[PDB]
Amino acid sequence: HHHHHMVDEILKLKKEKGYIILAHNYQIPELQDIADFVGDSLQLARKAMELSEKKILFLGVDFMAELVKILNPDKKVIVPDRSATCPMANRLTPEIIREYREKFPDAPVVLFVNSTSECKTLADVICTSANAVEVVKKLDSSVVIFGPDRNLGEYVAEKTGKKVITIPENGHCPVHQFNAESIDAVRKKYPDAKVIVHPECPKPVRDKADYVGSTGQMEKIPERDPSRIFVIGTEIGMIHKLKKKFPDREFVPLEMAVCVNMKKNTLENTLHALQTESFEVILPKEVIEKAKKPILRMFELMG
Ligand code: SF4
């Protein structure tokens, strides 16, 4: 295979230099295939608490790389592209969080994992798409401040019956803005297919799906649902993941949806990262100390 040179050297350098490679489900297939662990944000966060390797190469976006670092302050965490980020986070700021705390006195602040580490220092609890409902359900409050994703917060409100105040204004993931007409059309094309969508999708898409869940939840659905065809409403990288796990099922994208930031990582720049052991993820010690609290609370509210 024509990529063999990069694949072979990545595997050699990872072993020689003592790295574990963690990747998100939206990474390109070629990178998923060289990673030691590929999962959703919650699975990556849990893996980050467990792993023993002294050095971590993380393949995803910066806020998750930083979460890995927060949980492993004394390990070296590197990423191949230091600009890979989630655009939804930048609109959420400390000033907005403090404004809303005052506006809603005793409402806990629940931040989605795609948020700056600075913002996480101000959060009561972190969540991911997988556990947001569970986290908010278990909190001792009928009102929560939630951000940055409005769709996820609205889904949480539905599922919990609680008041969810979303910050900032119109925070959303462009990748998951499918139109529900795509579900109508695929219902006609494949009448027995099951439609699985991400909770970051807008409400009419969520409401027309058979299942709503994180990418890790999506991967578990075929363990219990014997359907021959699944239609997948999330970023295109998950198709490869699902097809690998379940070669005897068919996975159809709801629409083509690409996260440009997730695609910044390539075989070439991942090789360069292992050659140079760059770019290290570095945070102020104060940020680690403060942000770890709501991250650890997330795990306390699950189990
Ligand atoms: S897919 Fe959406 S929410 Fe996830 S990193 Fe990309 S822009 Fe952010």
Cβ neighbourhood burial of 206 (10 Å; 0-12, 13-18, 19+): buried
Sheet holding 37-39, edge to edge: 37-39, 19-24, 55-59, 76-78
Same domain, 124 and 76: no
Q: Strand pairing partners for 237?
A: none
The domain of 178 spans: 173-256
d(C-alpha 216, C-alpha 71), whole Å: 20
Judge if 60 and 128 occupy the same domain: no
Distance 234 CA to ligand 1 centre (A): 10
Question: Which resolution, in Å, applies to this structure?
Answer: 1.5
Which amino acids bring their CB within 6 angstroms of ligand 1?
A: 61, 86-88, 114, 173, 175, 200, 235, 259, 261-262
Per-residue b/e over 259-278, b at no fewer than 16 CB within 10 Å? bebbbbbbbeebbebbeeee
Q: How far apart are the first and last CA of the chain?
A: 45
Residues forming a β-bridge with 21: 57
User: Considering its fold, how many domains does the chain have in total?
Assistant: 3
Tell which of 172, 194, 228 closes a domain.
172
Method for this entry: X-ray
**Ligand 1: distance of its center to the CA of 24 in Å?**
11
| Cα 282 to ligand 1 centre (Å) | 22
Any domain includes 302: no
Tell whether 168 and 179 lie within a shared domain: no
Q: 12 alpha carbon to ligand 1 midpoint, in Å?
A: 31
Cis? peptide before 148, omega within 30° of 0: yes
Chain centre to alpha carbon of residue 66: 13
Residue 24 falls within a domain, yes or no?
Answer: yes
Mutate to test the pocket of ligand 1, among 85, 262, 264 (most ligand atoms within 8 A of CB): 262
Q: Are 139 and 163 a contacting pair, CB within 8 Å?
A: no
Residue nearest to atom 8 of ligand 1 (CA): 86
Pocket test for ligand 1, best of 175, 200, 263, 264 (most atoms within 8 A of CB): 175
User: Which of 122, 152, 172 is the endpoint of a domain?
Assistant: 172
- Same domain membership, residue 224 and residue 210: yes
Query: Which token pair is 123?
Result: 């959060």
CATH number at residue 168: 3.40.50.10800
Q: What is the residue with the minimal CA distance to atom 6 of ligand 1?
A: 259
The gap from C-alpha 182 to its chain's centroid, in whole angstroms, comes to 24
Residues 184 and 150 in one domain: no
- CA of residue 195 to ligand 1 center, whole Å: 20
Joined together, the tokens standing for residue 282 give 């570095």
